[PDB]
Symmetry: C3
Subunit: 32 residues, 3 copies
């Protein structure tokens, strides 16, 4: 599914993130 | 357009970067 | 070929990594 490396996440709330933390969506990567 | 997360940028000079700072180009990501 | 930016690598053993360090494979990015 998803993978959190340091501050960057390669589900959002599952790892403590929210879509105000996503930084890119391929048509994701979240960061905080 | 572009998005700078810590040291990594997901325009270059707009955010203080130059192409000697890009690290990948999908056919970008800059880092310093 | 490959490019190591801080903790993130955009060959594995060439830069001191192993596939237990890869975090994404586009069909790579390693991290430690």
């Amino acid at each position: 599914q998803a993978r959190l490396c340091d501050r960057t996440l390669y589900m959002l709330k599952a790892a403590g993130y929210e879509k105000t933390d996503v930084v890119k969506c391929n048509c994701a990567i979240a960061y905080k």
